[PDB]
Amino acid sequence: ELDADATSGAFYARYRDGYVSGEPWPGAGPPPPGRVLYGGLGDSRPGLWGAPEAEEARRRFEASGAPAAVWAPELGDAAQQYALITRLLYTPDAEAMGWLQNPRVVPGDVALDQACFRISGAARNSSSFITGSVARAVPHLGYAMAAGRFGWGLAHAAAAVAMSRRYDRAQKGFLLTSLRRAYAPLLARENAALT
Amino acid sequence: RRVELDADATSGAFYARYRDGYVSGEPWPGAGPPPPGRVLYGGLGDSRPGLWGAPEAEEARRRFEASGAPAAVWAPELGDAAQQYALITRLLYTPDAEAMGWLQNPRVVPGDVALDQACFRISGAARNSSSFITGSVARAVPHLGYAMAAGRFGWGLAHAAAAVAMSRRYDRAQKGFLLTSLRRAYAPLLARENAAL
DNA sequence: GCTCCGTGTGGACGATCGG
DNA sequence: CCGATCGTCCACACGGAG
Ligand SMILES: [Cl-]
Ligand SMILES: [Mg+2]
Numbered sequence: 230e231l232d233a234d235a236t237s238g239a240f241y242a243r244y245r246d247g248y249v250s251g252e253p254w255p256g257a258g259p260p261p262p263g264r265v266l267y268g269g270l271g272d273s274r275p276g277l278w279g280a281p282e283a284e285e286a287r288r289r290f291e292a293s294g295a296p297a298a299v300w301a302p303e304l305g306d307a308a309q310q311y312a313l314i315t316r317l318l319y320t321p322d323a324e325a326m327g328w329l330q331n332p333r334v335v336p337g338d339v340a341l342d343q344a345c346f347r348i349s350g351a352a353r354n355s356s357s358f359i360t361g362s363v364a365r366a367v368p369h370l371g372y373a374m375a376a377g378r379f380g381w382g383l384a385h386a387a388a389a390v391a392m393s394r395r396y397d398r399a400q401k402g403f404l405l406t407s408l409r410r411a412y413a414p415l416l417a418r419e420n421a422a423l424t
Numbered sequence: 425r426r427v428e429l430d431a432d433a434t435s436g437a438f439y440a441r442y443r444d445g446y447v448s449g450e451p452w453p454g455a456g457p458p459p460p461g462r463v464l465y466g467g468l469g470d471s472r473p474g475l476w477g478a479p480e481a482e483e484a485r486r487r488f489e490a491s492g493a494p495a496a497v498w499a500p501e502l503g504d505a506a507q508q509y510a511l512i513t514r515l516l517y518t519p520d521a522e523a524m525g526w527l528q529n530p531r532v533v534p535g536d537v538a539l540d541q542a543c544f545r546i547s548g549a550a551r552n553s554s555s556f557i558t559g560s561v562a563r564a565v566p567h568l569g570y571a572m573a574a575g576r577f578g579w580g581l582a583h584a585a586a587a588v589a590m591s592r593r594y595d596r597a598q599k600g601f602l603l604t605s606l607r608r609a610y611a612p613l614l615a616r617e618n619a620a621l
Numbered sequence: 622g623c624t625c626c627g628t629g630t631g632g633a634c635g636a637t638c639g640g
Numbered sequence: 641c642c643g644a645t646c647g648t649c650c651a652c653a654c655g656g657a658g
Contacts, residue, residue: 382605
């Protein structure tokens with residue numbers, strides 16, 4: 230169906246949901262002890278704390294001041310990576326969409342990524358596995374779902390567009406501007422309430 | 425490059441001051457209507473000849489016009505892109521509609537196949553691999569160039585939600601969370617954009 | 622006239638899933 | 641048989657130097 234209540238815009242101005250920002254999404258929570266979020270909702274993989282791959286990447290992440298090209302929960306708090314990627318999506322000339330799809334990766338970034346899916350249970354990286362993040366730089370969606378932070382959905386939506394092969398460079402730039410306009414008031418209102 | 429976090433962005437005040445140099449309702453830089461007798465197709469500025477007279481286009485147009493629902497496989501020959509955008513946008517806000525599942529796994533009838541094959545034949549034969557730019561990640565969603573030509577950023581919701589729906593990295597509950605995130609973000613934008621235009 | 626660089630695009634082909 | 645995403649590799653433009 231389609232009414233004049235929709236084409237005029239009044240149906241969207243009255244949008245309300247039963248969820249509360251800052252409250253856990255139904256079924257979402259922290260991973261079991263000694264494990265980190267991975268895969269589908271509620272799933273997890275063993276952590277790689279003390280492993281050479283995780284610790285080498287943790288030091289590089291803490292020393293760069295930039296968002297990590299390959300992120301894992303062993304590297305730090307997901308809120309830091311979410312905020313760095315979110316800010317990156319709003320800085321002009323940053324090439325955020327190109328960086329989300331094809332970031333420059335040192336061998337340590339490759340070794341970290343290979344260790345995470347291997348310790349989960351995978352023999353090789355495969356396009357069919359549900360990981361909870363379409364781009365390796367974006368933290369697992371379960372951390373946004375557990376914290377009830379809908380503004381962290383922007384990182385995943387922008388990365389899903391960036392990772393798609395069906396849009397060219399100029400088309401992705403328009404979609405990034407669309408997402409900037411949509412999420413800017415949400416992020417401003419959400420970051421104020423939870424600070 | 426490098427990103428500097430600070431209290432201006434952590435408190436949210438950097439996002440409250442967001443402004444861009446674009447104007448809603450005005451063409452995106454480099455974007456415009458297709459040439460006469462052609463429809464938008466492929467990358468930015470590209471186009472293919474229209475099929476407004478072919479039997480495949482007319483069969484699908486009647487099915488679209490007789491259902492009152494958005495077409496599962498859409499082409500410019502079926503009607504106004506703005507109407508299909510509005511139907512998909514309304515569908516994305518409809519409870520119990522299974523919108524993400526429908527975007528990812530639509531029913532494709534023989535008439536849809538004949539329409540889709542007629543569109544690629546009237547263009548050039550580029551396919552020899554699976555990597556090709558279409559301008560829309562889901563066939564039900566009109567070409568992005570129509571949103572770019574009209575400067576309608578609210579029509580980006582249909583493409584952003586469809587890109588999530590087609591991704592293989594999220595399960596059903598994760599895609600449901602992302603739809604709610606996109607609903608909240610775009611609801612004030614759509615309300616404000618539909619009023620001005 | 623060839624290469625040499627880094628870097629930024631899209632294509633090619635396969636793995637895996639599924640109608 | 642068809643085709644979807646996405647890992648992985650690669651083709652090519654960029655241009656002042658030899
Ligand atoms: Cl709320
Ligand atoms: Mg066949």
